[PDB]
Amino acid sequence: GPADCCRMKECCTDRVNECLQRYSGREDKFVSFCYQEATVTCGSFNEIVGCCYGYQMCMIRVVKPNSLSGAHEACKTVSCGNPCA
Amino acid sequence: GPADCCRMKECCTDRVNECLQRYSGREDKFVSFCYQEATVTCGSFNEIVGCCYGYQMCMIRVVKPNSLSGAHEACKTVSCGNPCA
Amino acid sequence: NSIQIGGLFPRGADQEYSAFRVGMVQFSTSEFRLTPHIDNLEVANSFAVTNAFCSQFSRGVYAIFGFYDKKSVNTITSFCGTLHVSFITPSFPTDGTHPFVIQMRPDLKGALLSLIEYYQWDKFAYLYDSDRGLSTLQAVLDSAAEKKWQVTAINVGNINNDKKDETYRSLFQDLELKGERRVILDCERDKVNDIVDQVITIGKHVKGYHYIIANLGFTDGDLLKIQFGGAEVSGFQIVDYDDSLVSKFIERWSTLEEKEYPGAHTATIKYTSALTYDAVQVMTEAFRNLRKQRIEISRRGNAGDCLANPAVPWGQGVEIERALKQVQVEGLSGNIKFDQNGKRINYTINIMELKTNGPRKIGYWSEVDKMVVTLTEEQKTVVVTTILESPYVMMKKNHEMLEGNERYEGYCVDLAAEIAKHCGFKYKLTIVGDGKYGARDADTKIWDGM
Amino acid sequence: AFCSQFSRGVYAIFGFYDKKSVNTITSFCGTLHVSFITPSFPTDGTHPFVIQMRPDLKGALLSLIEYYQWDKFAYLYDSDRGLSTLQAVLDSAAEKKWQVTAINVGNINNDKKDETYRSLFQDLELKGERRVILDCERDKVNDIVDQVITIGKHVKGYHYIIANLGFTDGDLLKIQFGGAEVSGFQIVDYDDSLVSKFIERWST
Amino acid sequence: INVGNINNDKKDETYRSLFQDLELKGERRVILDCERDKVNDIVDQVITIGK
Amino acid sequence: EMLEGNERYEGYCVDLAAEIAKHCGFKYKLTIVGDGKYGARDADTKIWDGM
Ligand SMILES: *[C@@H]1O[C@H](CO)[C@@H](O)[C@H](O)[C@H]1NC(C)=O
């Protein structure tokens, strides 16, 4: 049906987090994998970019093992940047 | 300085609404003007598309003179569509 | 100086009464001697507890030492509160302000939560039963909401033992579904053991799992079962056998004959029994402190009927209560002191971890300091996956006459040999099953290929 | 009181119990073979010589949650009727994909409780949770409602589910015009002819 | 809008209709020039409809 | 000479720097290395020089 932006973002963060939850303790390793799953499930305007790029980067650089919850809670508000290129 | 998506959208609807509030009874006529100004103020990923296109269309098709408040209140949650195309 | 004190021992409690008698012998003095009246009952039965309590009351006991259950605990608290009779118990601490009750057991909440914070658990599973009450559950739920924890609360107490086989397999199936590994067991030792056996049976005791046993009896039960399983297990110990007091006590305990004192011949002792011993100490020291302060609590006449309405409490009771609460002594549970309400104060809960060689103390927990840590502590053939492509990997003309890595020739083969040569490992060349490089299927979302 | 009734030689007893006293009633009625009938919350287990007038609310609540299709919500409870319902919805949350926030409002004293609720709903603002289930006695329900209206969370976008058989027993006029969805359970239908006649006699 | 001519006995829905009509124009900013009692009434009605 | 900071420099690596910083979401300050060498390890002192 119709595509959104905000909906895609709010979906993106949640699916990333929920994905990383299965990978607890190895969490810092699987951020990109889970981001792939989130980009697939929530869809993306540019497949390279993904659902939310800035959140992905923020998570990748911040997330440490077992530190997930606080990390996501800090990163979920972050600007996604341009979902074009 | 990323513009995200949601912040841009909520900005878009807010500026459109606040602009249309200035024109009473002419609301249905000035929708495109206020959308233009809102796209200017909130910025856009695609200049042609604007900050939120689906909201613009929703407003144009719904808004009747003096019907502003309810129309906007209905249109601000709508999907913006593809911001890049 | 005969001091009449009632006592209540649940049928099947032996080592507790044994340690009680040992406490009677060791803390006995020429000044005064406690004259216990022991009454065995069904601890879960409220009627039985009521009857026993009024029996001890009519007998005119100056204090009562006993046990209660989630069912019976309100009977004890309410009755002891009304009749101003002091009650001393090893059984689980009451959540609330209950007067005329002295709870020997320390509060485990702080130790547990601090342990969770220590292991940095963001998400875990909580297995509980309703025996000792849901107080801990409420605590960990509120702390989960505060610290943003995702906690799975599952009641294992309501599952009937007759029909419980597949129920637990389904339980750990649902628990394996989300990939949640970390698990906390808050349960009675019997239920704990059952769950453990179910775990080894379903093979959930393998590497990757972390179990937290919440109780003071961590080394009291058999840990040998999951010891070699390869899963980490952590828990709490209220009795340190490295202490000289506990060591000598253990020597005397182990030299005792089993016939006279049931289940008293052992290397260790259940924490409940130890708490009973220490309770004996507390009572003796309390009445001693009563005699040193020159206050006579002696009864003038019989107490009469406990149910007689309106109930009238005796005055001396309050004095005996204060006497008990003001006690500070050294015992098997460590430093023993109480607050105004009767809860334990200033304790040390040893934080222990089960390792290959056996259990070891990784630290201690204090009511103030929270968690404090004690002393800080071949080659496998490498599987090489590859695909047939020219001239990267190719089959030799004579390949049927050869075996293993000699079967293949190509650029990637030589490169593999070089990489293995520099990194110093033995390698096994294998062709991928599906014969693809790599991809994620749009439907199954599964990566296929090398 | 029970032994008083017993010595008087009564053939049955009608009464109420609390989370504290209920085991006393069950044990005594079971032992002395005296029948006990009560409106108070159903005991969880198989207890003989007790007739519990109150129906079990668990199924209705869970079915309602499934009906509204709630993935994540907040659960406000007290220690008065017991945590049985809480345990139930937690186990069902474990079975489903539900994310549930359990918060105990019962241990908060009424004399000093002002900022306790502001802090509560502050923590509730943290997660942005707009779906909330109240499992409480009508008094705590009413208090919590007043606190909700005060901070203005009873406007549109919020959904409250009152768990009790007393949905129309408390005052709903307060949040009725607020614009927030409120759902609940009613064990007495005033549309029934029996109940209508009873009410006609009752109001006089 | 004159809120003074409204009788207290029948005034319930009068305020709901008032603020409905005020919602028509989307008007948020509102000035109350009134006696303390009428002020309290209007305020309570505002809290009730959650404005 | 009339400009300051990152505006002083232009080039491939400059634009690439802008892109990497834009993608990783950080503020960057372009600076020229002190010794003016790329990198090396001195065989005697075992000290790395350069970027
Ligand atoms: C033990 O008593 C209380 C326990 O909470 C605490 O305030 C006090 O500081 C403690 N005393 C010592 C010596 O640790």
From Swiss-Prot, chains A, B:
Key words, A-Z: Disulfide bond, Ion channel impairing toxin, Ionotropic glutamate receptor inhibitor, Neurotoxin, Postsynaptic neurotoxin, Secreted, Signal, Toxin
Positions of the site: Interaction with glutamate receptor 2 (GRIA2)? Answer: Q36, E47, A74
Which Gene Ontology molecular function entries are recorded, alphabetically?
identical protein binding; ion channel regulator activity; toxin activity
Please list the tissues where expression of this protein has been recorded: Expressed by the venom duct.
Might you report a single GO cellular component term? extracellular region
Q: What else is known?
A: Ikot-ikot is a Filipino word that translates to 'spinning around' or 'turning around', a reference to the swimming phenotype observed in fish injected with the toxin.
Q: What is the name of this protein?
A: Con-ikot-ikot
Organism equals Conus striatus (Striated cone)
UniProtKB/Swiss-Prot annotation, chain C:
Protein's name according to its UniProt entry: Glutamate receptor 2
Q: Does the keyword Lyase apply?
A: no
Any one of the GO CC terms = dendrite membrane
| UniProt miscellaneous comment | The postsynaptic actions of L-glutamate are mediated by a variety of receptors that are named according to their selective agonists. This receptor binds AMPA (quisqualate) > L-glutamate > kainate.
Q: Name one GO biological process term.
A: regulation of long-term synaptic depression
Question: Where does this protein come from, organism-wise?
Answer: Rattus norvegicus (Rat)
Glycosylation: residue positions = E232, N346, Q379
Q: How does it assemble?
A: Homotetramer or heterotetramer of pore-forming glutamate receptor subunits. Tetramers may be formed by the dimerization of dimers. May interact with MPP4. Forms a ternary complex with GRIP1 and CSPG4. Interacts with ATAD1 in an ATP-dependent manner. ATAD1-catalyzed ATP hydrolysis disrupts binding to ATAD1 and to GRIP1 and leads to AMPAR complex disassembly. Interacts with GRIP2. Interacts with GRIP1. Interacts with NSF via its C-terminus. Interacts with CACNG2, PICK1 and GRIP2. Interacts with GRIA1 and SYNDIG1. Part of a complex containing GRIA2, NSF and NAPA and/or NAPB.
Q: Where in the cell is it found?
A: Cell membrane; Postsynaptic cell membrane; Postsynaptic density membrane
- Reported tissue expression: Detected in forebrain. Detected in dendrites of neuronal cells. Expressed in the pyramidal cell layers of CA1 and CA3 and in the granule cell layer of the dentate gyrus.
Disulfide linkage: C54-C306
Q: Does the keyword Cell membrane apply?
A: yes
This molecule's function is given as:
Ionotropic glutamate receptor that functions as a ligand-gated cation channel, gated by L-glutamate and glutamatergic agonists such as alpha-amino-3-hydroxy-5-methyl-4-isoxazolepropionic acid (AMPA), quisqualic acid, and kainic acid. L-glutamate acts as an excitatory neurotransmitter at many synapses in the central nervous system and plays an important role in fast excitatory synaptic transmission.
What induces this protein's gene, according to its Swiss-Prot or TrEMBL record?
A: Down-regulated in the pyramidal cell layer of CA1 in the hippocampus by global ischemia.
Site-annotated residues for Interaction with the cone snail toxin Con-ikot-ikot:
R440
> Superkingdom of the source?
Eukaryota
Q: What is its main location?
A: membrane
Topology Extracellular: residue spans: 1-450
UniProtKB/Swiss-Prot annotation, chain E:
Which locations, inside or outside the cell, does it occupy? Cell membrane; Postsynaptic cell membrane; Postsynaptic density membrane
State the post-translational modifications.
Palmitoylated. Depalmitoylated upon L-glutamate stimulation. Ubiquitinated by RNF167, leading to its degradation.
According to UniProt, the tissues expressing it are described as: Detected in forebrain. Detected in dendrites of neuronal cells. Expressed in the pyramidal cell layers of CA1 and CA3 and in the granule cell layer of the dentate gyrus.
Q: Organism's domain of life? A: Eukaryota
**Which signals induce this protein?**
Down-regulated in the pyramidal cell layer of CA1 in the hippocampus by global ischemia.
Domain comment in the entry: The M4 transmembrane segment mediates tetramerization and is required for cell surface expression.
Q: How does it assemble?
A: Homotetramer or heterotetramer of pore-forming glutamate receptor subunits. Tetramers may be formed by the dimerization of dimers. May interact with MPP4. Forms a ternary complex with GRIP1 and CSPG4. Interacts with ATAD1 in an ATP-dependent manner. ATAD1-catalyzed ATP hydrolysis disrupts binding to ATAD1 and to GRIP1 and leads to AMPAR complex disassembly. Interacts with GRIP2. Interacts with GRIP1. Interacts with NSF via its C-terminus. Interacts with CACNG2, PICK1 and GRIP2. Interacts with GRIA1 and SYNDIG1. Part of a complex containing GRIA2, NSF and NAPA and/or NAPB.
- What does this chain do? Ionotropic glutamate receptor that functions as a ligand-gated cation channel, gated by L-glutamate and glutamatergic agonists such as alpha-amino-3-hydroxy-5-methyl-4-isoxazolepropionic acid (AMPA), quisqualic acid, and kainic acid. L-glutamate acts as an excitatory neurotransmitter at many synapses in the central nervous system and plays an important role in fast excitatory synaptic transmission.
By sequence similarity, the record places it as follows: Belongs to the glutamate-gated ion channel (TC 1.A.10.1) family. GRIA2 subfamily.
Name of this chain's protein? Glutamate receptor 2
Q: Which organism is it from?
A: Rattus norvegicus
